[PDB]
């Protein structure tokens, strides 16, 4: 909301004459009490010959691209200057604003007698933008006839010593979107008497002598007040005086005709939007009713709106007059020949206007004030103020007829309920001991009726303050007017906390551990790539395709939430590779979204109580499963190239090692088992188990998936479900025997298909407690042992707890281990050795 | 009431003076302020803290409740500690 300081100063000055403050101080005071000041614009300065001119002659220059005009301009004292201008929104006889040779326009432009388009141009005719007077639009500024004589000083006529304040009013302060409301706020801040510009001393009521039009109101539309008054026989050719067109321009409104201009002016002045109907274009009774399915209205701008059965209209016998609270319609629109005007002063339902305007994308000046509740007490006063002013400008009478529907039964008293609040409650909440009588003085300034009953005030807020409705609301009024800067900084004592949880501590350890091992964390996106599961070649019934779906995504082809973190990880990989960073390991710890049934929403639960355990359980059950995952991808070189050697490309074993890093970080033991599971390679994919619970997969990606996806050849990947990895808090007590160890190496021949870990387990199982360590050295194949067999060489370290192991005692333990491998995996001993 | 404060217990009235009597001290009352003269075999009893321990141990320490104190906003670990 833009408005100019002069107008705001004028309204404040009625009850505190002589009031005046710098823009700086005004900006600061506005911020301190709660109003965001987006910009402070003083009206761009001019120097020198910038005066009113009158266009005495126009000559259309032909032969150029656009239409150009050589103009004779009367600039004062019977001097006529020739001026080139490219606009077209002016005729002979029009007052304009000329910047003449020697003048300096805002932006540091000096005007000079140039030659242009074949003629001499002694300056230029100005636009409201070029003078930093108002918004840039097509064409130059034209002053209304009789605003000033040719030769008058531009800066004084235009009022360029004024400053416009651009504010962002918060939706709880609708009353502040007008000179009325902001002026009241300043009188509160500055401790001034305030004369309300909507009151009767300042708007004397016009007569009330019978209805002004037939009106039926379906009251379930939420209309709270609906008033009409007519002004007849107005000059359709009159224009608004300069002072009024100016104030509208500084407020962001382009003036058009007195019928419209006067309703925009009173809207800005008092905060009650208004509308002017061409009365002679209404047919019959005015009806306020809901719209029907499929109904249409054409609004002032000539655009057909598709309506909705929750939209409130004004209709007559013939057509639609208004989308009530949002925008008038074409059928009763004031237009060039309109002589008899019916003025609408309505109070619509805030939620109704909100829904309708969002749905139609019509955030009009009217709608935005109704959304935030307009003061119903001032409808007739805004009506009367508006009628007098229209008659005064365009010269008709104000008919003494008046409709004033005020509900059924009529509501005569618009005040909210009273609020009971303890007198020191603002003191407690602020942590300040305010001077005595402070809370009651400040609530008085904002227009509430305050009465004392010991320690308990009763506060009845004014009608323009529907936001003031609990004691909390009243505290904010006291605290903001006293200033928030007076509130001290006092650390609270917080109780002994329990610190971070196991799961939180585990996710940090997983991240530190992966980052040290060379992985770079990304923030994954939860919006899947389009068709990623078709690229992976997933079956139609694969659980990962059952995705939750967003309904208004920022990319229309990426609306599915992720059931897996790999898509986002692979996306960041592709980005790194495409920028020349080809040796990359990335990881993510984030939640997935895995829905169980269909999207089942739970109905609204009353918020005047807490939900019951059953209601919470039902809300939880309605949401998708959202477990925490950890995932990683690797491509390129795992070990970089350097003096040591050429480096080592990523292989599936590096993803297996990433499982082991995560598991070590989680203090749990894993087992890897061969598995087939897209998007992994079928012979290089492992399913990960903690105990007997599957927790995810790891390995190399399927080369077909890599190819269809544009991934680096050989990309590996790992994904684990962190919710499936149980907590462990081990309390180890390692036996550390100091007696000498015995080292023996044993080679076993097994079927190629037997996993190496199976052979190690079998050797450990049979060897017993004497086996301190087992480790795989060699995996050898060759013809002499069998085309489908392989030799595994294990390094065994034996150690006794109480004695030095004899070497025969160790060989007994080996024999037992070899026999166990025979019985379990069919192993055949090939040879043993005393590791030297 | 000094033993009551230190223990965080509201001992029955006349408790501190009865227990100091048992240990052989001469106890005299002057409003809210006792004067306590310990016996010769008790050279350890020589400040008010010393007398508190006598009351508290004879009443039993098990009666003292478990009450977490409010500790103020701490600043956490230092840079050097976090670095190590």
UniProtKB/Swiss-Prot annotation, chain A:
Cofactors: Mg(2+)
Cofactor descriptive note:
Binds 2 magnesium ions per tetramer.
Which cysteines pair up through disulfides? They are: none
Keywords, A to Z?
Answer: Aminoacyl-tRNA synthetase, ATP-binding, Cytoplasm, Ligase, Magnesium, Metal-binding, Nucleotide-binding, Protein biosynthesis, RNA-binding, tRNA-binding
Subcellular location per the Swiss-Prot or TrEMBL entry: Cytoplasm
Provide the FDX-ACB domain boundaries.
Answer: 737-830
Listed under GO biological process in this entry are:
phenylalanyl-tRNA aminoacylation
Signal sequence span is none
Q: Which reaction does it catalyse?
A: tRNA(Phe) + L-phenylalanine + ATP = L-phenylalanyl-tRNA(Phe) + AMP + diphosphate + H(+)
SMART domains cross-referenced by the UniProt entry: B3_4 (SM00873), B5 (SM00874), FDX-ACB (SM00896)
Residues noted as binding Mg(2+) in the record, renumbered to the chain: 467, 473, 476-477
Q: Is-annotated flag, keyword NAD?
A: no
For molecular function, the Gene Ontology terms on record are:
ATP binding; magnesium ion binding; phenylalanine-tRNA ligase activity; tRNA binding
- State which Enzyme Commission number(s) the record gives: 6.1.1.20
- Start and end residues of each B5 domain: 414-489
Q: Which Pfam families match?
A: B3_4, B5, FDX-ACB, tRNA_bind, tRNA_synthFbeta
Instruction: Give the note.
Output: Was identified as a high-confidence drug target.
**What is the name attached to this protein's record?**
Phenylalanine--tRNA ligase beta subunit
The source organism is: Mycobacterium tuberculosis (strain ATCC 25618 / H37Rv)
State the taxonomy lineage: Bacteria, Bacillati, Actinomycetota, Actinomycetes, Mycobacteriales
């Amino acid at each position: 909301m833009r408005l100019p300081y002069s107008w705001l100063r004028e309204v404040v000055a009625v009850g505190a004459s002589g009031w005046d403050v710098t823009p700086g101080e005004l900006e600061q005071t506005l911020l301190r009490i709660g109003h965001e000041v987006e910009e402070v614009i003083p009206l761009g300065p001019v120097d020198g010959p910038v005066t009113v001119g009158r266009v005495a002659d126009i000559e259309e220059l032909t032969g150029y691209k656009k239409p150009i005009r050589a103009c004779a301009v009367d600039i004062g004292d019977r001097q006529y200057r020739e001026i080139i201008c490219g606009a077209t929104n002016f005729a002979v006889g029009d007052l304009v604003v000329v910047a003449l040779p020697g003048a300096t326009l805002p932006g540091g432009f000096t005007i000079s007698a140039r030659k242009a388009y074949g003629r001499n141009s002694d300056g230029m005719i100005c636009s409201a933008a070029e003078l930093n007077l108002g918004a840039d639009h097509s064409g130059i500024l034209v002053l209304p006839p009789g605003a000033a004589e040719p030769g008058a000083d531009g800066a004084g006529v235009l009022g360029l010593d004024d400053v416009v304040f651009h504010l962002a009013i918060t939706p709880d302060r609708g009353y502040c979107m007008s000179v009325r409301g902001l002026a009241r706020e300043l009188a509160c801040a500055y401790d001034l008497d305030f004369v309300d510009p909507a009151s009767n001393s300042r708007v004397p009521p016009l007569p009330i002598e019978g209805p002004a039009w037939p009106l039926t109101v379906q009251p379930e539309t939420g209309v709270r007040r609906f008033a009409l008054r007519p002004v007849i026989g107005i000059d359709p050719a009159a224009v608004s005086p300069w002072w009024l067109q100016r104030r509208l321009l500084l407020c962001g409104i382009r003036a058009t005709c007195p019928a419209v201009d006067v309703t925009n002016y009173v809207m800005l002045e008092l905060g009650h939007p208004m509308h002017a109907h061409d009365r002679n274009r209404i047919s019959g009774t005015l009806g306020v009713r809901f719209a029907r399915s499929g109904e249409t209205a054409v609004t002032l701008d000539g655009i057909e709106r598709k309506l909705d059965t929750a939209d409130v209209l004004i209709v007559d016998d013939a057509a639609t007059a208004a989308i009530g609270g949002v925008m008038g319609a074409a059928s009763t629109e004031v237009r060039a020949d309109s002589t008899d005007v019916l003025l609408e002063a309505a109070i619509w339902d805030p939620a109704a206007v909100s829904r309708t305007q969002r749905r139609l994308h019509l955030p009009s000046e009217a709608a935005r004030r109704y959304e935030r509740t307009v003061d119903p007490a001032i409808s007739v006063a805004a009506l009367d103020r508006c009628a007098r002013l229209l008659a005064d400008i365009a010269g008709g009478e104000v008919s003494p007829t008046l409709t004033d529907w005020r509900g059924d039964p009529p509501c005569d008293d618009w005040s909210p309920p009273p609020i009971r609040m303890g007198v020191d409650v603002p003191d407690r909440i602020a942590g300040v001991a305010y001077p005595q009588g402070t809370t009651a003085r400040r609530l008085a300034q904002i227009g509430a009726v305050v009465t004392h009953d010991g320690d308990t005030l009763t506060v009845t807020p004014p009608s323009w303050r529907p936001d003031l409705r609990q004691p909390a609301d009243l505290v904010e009024e006291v605290l903001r007017l006293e200033g928030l800067e007076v509130i001290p900084s006092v650390l609270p004592p917080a109780p002994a906390g329990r610190g971070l949880t196991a799961g939180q501590q585990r996710r940090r350890t997983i991240g530190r551990s992966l980052a040290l091992s060379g992985y770079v964390e990304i923030l994954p996106t939860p919006f899947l790539p389009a068709g990623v599961f078709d690229l992976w070649g997933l079956e139609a019934d694969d659980s990962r395709r059952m995705t939750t779906r967003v309904l208004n995504p920022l990319e229309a082809d990426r609306p599915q939430l992720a059931t897996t973190l790999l898509p986002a990880l692979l996306e960041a990989l592709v980005r790194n590779v495409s920028r020349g960073l080809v040796d990359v390991a990335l990881f993510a710890i984030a939640q997935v979204v895995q829905p169980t049934e269909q999207t089942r929403g739970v109905g609204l639960i009353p918020v005047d109580r807490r939900p019951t355990d059953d209601e919470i359980a039902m809300l939880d059950a309605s949401l998708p499963r959202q477990p925490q995952h950890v995932a990683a991808v690797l491509a390129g070189l795992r070990e970089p190239r350097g003096p040591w050697g050429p480096g080592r490309p990523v292989e599936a074993a590096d993803a297996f090692e990433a499982v082991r890093i995560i598991a070590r970080a989680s203090r749990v033991d894993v087992t890897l088992r061969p598995a087939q599971y897209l998007p992994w390679h079928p012979g290089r994919c492992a399913q990960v188990f903690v105990g007997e619970s599957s927790v995810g997969h790891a390995g190399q990606l399927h080369p077909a998936v890599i190819e269809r996806s544009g991934l680096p050849k050989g990309t590996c990947a790992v994904e684990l479900n962190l919710d499936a990895i149980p907590c462990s808090a081990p309390l180890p007590a390692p036996r550390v025997s100091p007696y000498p160890a015995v080292f023996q190496d044993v080679s076993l021949v097994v079927a190629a298909d037997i996993p190496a870990q199976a052979v190690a387990d079998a050797v450990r199982a049979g060897a017993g407690d004497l086996l301190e360590d087992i480790a795989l050295f060699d995996v050898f194949t060759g013809p002499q042992i069998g085309e489908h067999r392989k030799s595994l060489t294990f390094a065994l370290r034996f150690r006794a707890p109480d004695r030095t192991l004899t070497e025969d005692d160790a060989s007994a333990a080996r024999d037992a281990a070899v026999q166990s491998a025979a019985e379990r995996v069919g192993a055949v001993l090939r040879g043993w050795k005393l590791a030297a």
